[PDB]
Structures are given as C-alpha cells and as structure tokens.
Nucleic acid binder design. Structure first.
Ligand SMILES: [Mg+2]
Ligand SMILES: [Mg+2]
Lengths: 113, 59, 175, 79
RNA sequence: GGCUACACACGUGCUACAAUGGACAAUACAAAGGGCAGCGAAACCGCGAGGUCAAGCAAAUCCCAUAAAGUUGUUCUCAGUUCGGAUUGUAGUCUGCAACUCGACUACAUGAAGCUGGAAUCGCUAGUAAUCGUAGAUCAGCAUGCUACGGUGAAUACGUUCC
C-alpha cells in the first residue's frame, strides 16, 4: 500500500505508482525525483525509508478520493445547471461536440436497435 | 476457548512510524508490526485536510 | 487492554456526569461484538465459505460458527440446513482489542474513507458497521484475497439509549 | 477568450447590465448574444436568450459564471 | 441558429489489437514544393502548445526544415499489460469581432471496446503491393481526406482446367 491502495510487487516503482487513480507516468517520475529513489527498483525490494519518502511526497497530491470527488461534483454541478454538457451527461452522449450520427459508442453503449 | 481449534493469538506491537504511535495488542499475525496510517496520523480524526466566482476574479 | 483501562479510568466518569448516574452499574458497557459475513454464494461454491471461515478466523482469533439456513428459499436456490455466513461472538479483553483495532488500524485503511455512518442504531443502543472489503485488516495479506467481500460488525451494549451509545463510542474513539 | 486577453462580453449587454445595476431587477433583458461570457455581476438577473426562434428565459446563478449564455438555450429540440 | 441532430443500416479511410513490438539516450541517408506585410534563423522565457526581441529572404543565397521508418544501446516479459488511446474532467496556447451551440494544438489525470475478425469480399505482376515520414492547393484558424514527393522493399505469376 501507498496511498491507501495496493500496488503490484513485480512492477517497478514508476509503473506501479500509475495504478493509483490520480497518478500517471509524469507524476510518478516527478514524485520519484522528489523522494529520490531509483526507478529501476521494485517495491518487493524497497525499504521503509524509500517507501516513506514516497508516501510523504504523495500526500501532497490529490489522489484516490478527492479526485473522484472533484470529477463527480463538477459533473453534477453542470447537470444541476441546465447546461449543454450537463444535458449530454444526463443523456449519455458525447460532450466535446462530436457527431452522434455515427461512431459515438463509448458514450452510447453497444448497438441497440 | 477450546484447546485444539483456536490460533496463536499473541500480543504484538503496532507502530505508526509516521507518528511513532506504539500500541500494544493481540493478533494472529506471527514482535513489531508496520502500520502507515492511524487515528493519530489519519486526516479525519486529526481534523486537518489537505468556486466559479473567486476563480473568475483572479483572471 | 488499553481500551478497557481507558473505559474504567475516564469514560465512566465523563459519561456518568453527562447522564446523572447514581450508581456505576447504570453505566454502559459493551457486552459483545458479533461479526458476520452473510455468505450467500455458498449455494454455488463451498470453497467460498471455507475462505470466509478462514478469514473471520484469522481476523478475530477463533473458529467462526457456521450459520445455517433458517427457512428455505427458491429465488436463491436456498434450502434449509445449508450453510450461510459465519458468526463470531467476542467478549472481554479480545473485544476491547478488536474494537481498538477497528478505531485505530482498519477503518483508517478504507479505500475512500470520509466517515462511518452515524445513524447506525436500532433505537436501543446497538451499533452496526457496513464494511465493504475484508483485506482492510492487517492480518489479511491482500494477495490471498479470493474474493473482495464485506462484513457486518454488530456491537451490543447495556446502554438503553442511542445517545449514551454515541458518547461511549466517541469516548473510545469512534467517528 | 480561452486566452490571456481576458473573457468576452458584448458591450451593449454590459451597458444594459450596468443600467440594471440599481438591483431592482424588475425586467428581463432581451438578447441575441449567446457568444458573451457570464460575469458575477449577472447573478439574480433574468436573461432572455435567442435560441433561433424563441427568446427563452434563463435564471443566472453563481454556478454559471465561467460559462456562456448559449449553454442554456438549446438550439436543437430532439425527442 | 441550422447544414456538426441520432433508436439504427451501409460505404470509404485512420488508430489499434502487440515482442519483426512499447518507452527512453546517441547517431545517419532524401526528394519535391511553397514564401511580402509572407516564410520567420538565432538567442531568451515556458514541462509543452507557444510568446518577446529580431536577422536574412521577392530565391539554387534566407526561411518553412532536426525527415521518419533505421542503426546501436538500456528496460519491459506475453498479462487487457509500460499494447491500445477512445471517453471524460481540469489548467492552457494560437487564430479570429466572437471558439457553448461548433476550431485545432498542448500539459496533467482517468484509461473504453479491442487478443487479428462470420457469411462474404477488395487492391496489386516491380522499384509494384506493404510500410515510413515530407510538401503543396484551398486556408485568418482547422486535413485521419485530395493532389504531388521521395526512403526501405517483397513473394508469385506452372498454365487457361474453371468464374
Ligand atoms: Mg455535410
Ligand atoms: Mg503508450
């Protein structure tokens, strides 16, 4: 565990940190710079000091909770106002102005007919 | 407690090295145990936590 | 026995002042905790219940009682005599230990903690926890989880009233 | 304007809001300018936006500032 | 404002499904084209899209412009993964009289179906298919398309039995 969530043992550090919601490759590299470990390491072999350096760096960064809250609350907000994007969120249709005549199936689900 | 079916439930130590809170109690764990977060290191107990108008005024 | 010594040393006083008690024996105590698992999948796989048993048994420290079917149901393909769940009554030093563990170790390991529920009373002074995941415990290595599963931790009291229960639990350290 | 130039608002609309800045707010303001940005000085007003065949009512709130009037007058009626 | 709708059906292309591969550091070899209130060198700032100052340039002179695939190294280890990069949220840039309807690009975070495709069907006989990038026209801004360009570079075609 690092940020209240497990991470793989056999994946290296830079990659394992990416299995948090909120933390990607860039942030992982920058975190490992700040809490200076090597990227080659693997968390089955890391020590208490290394792991705690990392935890200390990670605590400053919104992740595994507040990030889900930010996203959900932003969407609920734009729905509570009768906005275009929030109408689209309420209907299950694309938001960025794609065309729904064809090829919108991530937001529409599979083919219904 | 029947002799034959219950585990080895022995007294161990819970160390929150983040804030070094060293608590003693039992476990079936198999003596110093590692814990990262706790009632003395977790936000909600400790009470310390880490707007379209104010946003638009800065710009 | 940190929590029990705490109870007898402070909370008896800090509670009897709040509820004008003439005798110590009015004061609340936890008489037991019951820990269930409610395993309905054992119709379809008994290995499930074996894992459940082992995990309650490791968490608490005693072999859980296999509960059984009380009345037979066909929506779930469920016949009387069949095992469902398993329970564990806890009393004494082990109760106070498990409860301090809860307040101090596991609950601060929830994936998305923002507070326990605060209305989880039957109206008489008993408390339940709607747990989601079992690996939240340190005894459980997260690698041996055969199924993420929740639990129920009932807490049973000699308080007649929910507010007395709230104060007791806060004074131990519940949120 | 999605850019360091600062937002966009049409000048006539700004003037009419400053005219309505006496805060009595008896009247709906009429408009066609969906292009405009909403400011915090529009709260508690009632604007009447042109969707293409109707000057439809929209009530302004504080959750509506980094947005546009056009977000609240759907031009496409689909059932 | 709409031609950008969406319960669905078809056509034509792009990205992929991974190890003949992903990421990362070094390094190499082209064509052809365009450029005046237009191409914008170098330097500086910014993680980047870019921005400030500004030189040359109406051309075999200066610019777009460091071609990429490659080669050599490290690392990944056959998993929905370090493949994939949709979708969505945030902070931004450039253009524009204004990017919600309805621009492109960027950074961060998330990480969809997809593990080589049913019946059927298509292109191609050589510098061709296949693959890799590059330029232009329109164009304030927008190109997975259109037209042109070159780099690497196959296998097979017995024969007219049959459609
Ligand atoms: Mg059209
Ligand atoms: Mg990738």
């Amino acid at each position: 565990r690092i940020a209240g969530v497990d991470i793989p043992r056999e994946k290296r550090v830079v990659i394992s940190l990416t299995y948090i919601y909120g933390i990607g490759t860039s942030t992982a590299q920058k975190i490992l710079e700040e809490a200076n470990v090597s990227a080659d390491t693997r968390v089955k072999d890391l020590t208490d000091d290394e792991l705690g350096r990392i935890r200390e760096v990670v605590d400053g960064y919104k992740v595994e909770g507040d990030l889900r809250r930010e996203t959900n609350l932003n969407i609920k907000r734009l729905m509570e106002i009768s906005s275009y994007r929030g109408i689209r969120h309420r209907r299950g249709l694309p938001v960025r102005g794609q065309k729904t005549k064809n090829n919108a199936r991530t937001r529409k689900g599979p083919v219904k007919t | 407690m029947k002799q034959g079916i219950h585990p080895e439930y022995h007294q161990v130590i819970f160390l929150d090295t983040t804030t070094n809170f060293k608590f003693l109690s039992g476990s079936t764990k198999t003596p110093v145990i590692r814990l990262d977060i706790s009632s003395d290191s977790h936000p909600f107990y400790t009470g310390r936590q880490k707007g379209r108008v104010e946003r638009f005024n800065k710009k | 026995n940190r929590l029990k010594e705490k109870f007898n040393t402070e909370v008896t006083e800090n509670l009897m002042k709040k509820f004008n008690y003439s005798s110590v024996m009015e004061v609340p105590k936890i008489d037991k905790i019951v820990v269930n698992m409610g395993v309905g999948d054992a119709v379809q796989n008994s290995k499930v219940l074996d894992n459940a048993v082992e995990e309650l048994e490791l968490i608490t420290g005693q072999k859980p009682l296999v509960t059984k079917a009380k009345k037979s149901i066909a929506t779930f393909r469920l016949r009387e005599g069949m095992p469902i769940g398993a329970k564990v009554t806890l009393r004494g030093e082990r109760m106070y230990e498990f409860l301090d563990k809860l307040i101090s170790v596991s609950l601060p390991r929830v994936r998305d903690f923002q507070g326990v529920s605060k209305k989880a009373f039957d109206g008489r002074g008993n408390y339940t926890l709607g747990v989601k995941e079992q690996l939240i415990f340190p005894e459980i290595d997260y690698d041996k989880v055969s199924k993420v599963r929740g639990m129920d931790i009932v807490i049973v009291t000699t308080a007649n009233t929910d507010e007395e229960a709230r104060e007791l639990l806060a004074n131990f350290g519940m949120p | 304007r999605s850019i360091k130039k600062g937002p966009f608002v049409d000048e006539h609309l700004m003037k009419k809001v400053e005219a309505q800045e006496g805060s009595e707010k008896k009247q709906v303001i009429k408009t066609w300018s969906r292009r405009s940005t909403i400011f915090p000085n529009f709260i508690g007003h009632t604007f009447a936006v042109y969707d293409g065949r109707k000057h439809v009512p929209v009530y302004v709130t504080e959750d509506m500032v980094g947005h546009k009037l056009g977000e609240f007058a759907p031009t496409r009626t689909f059932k």
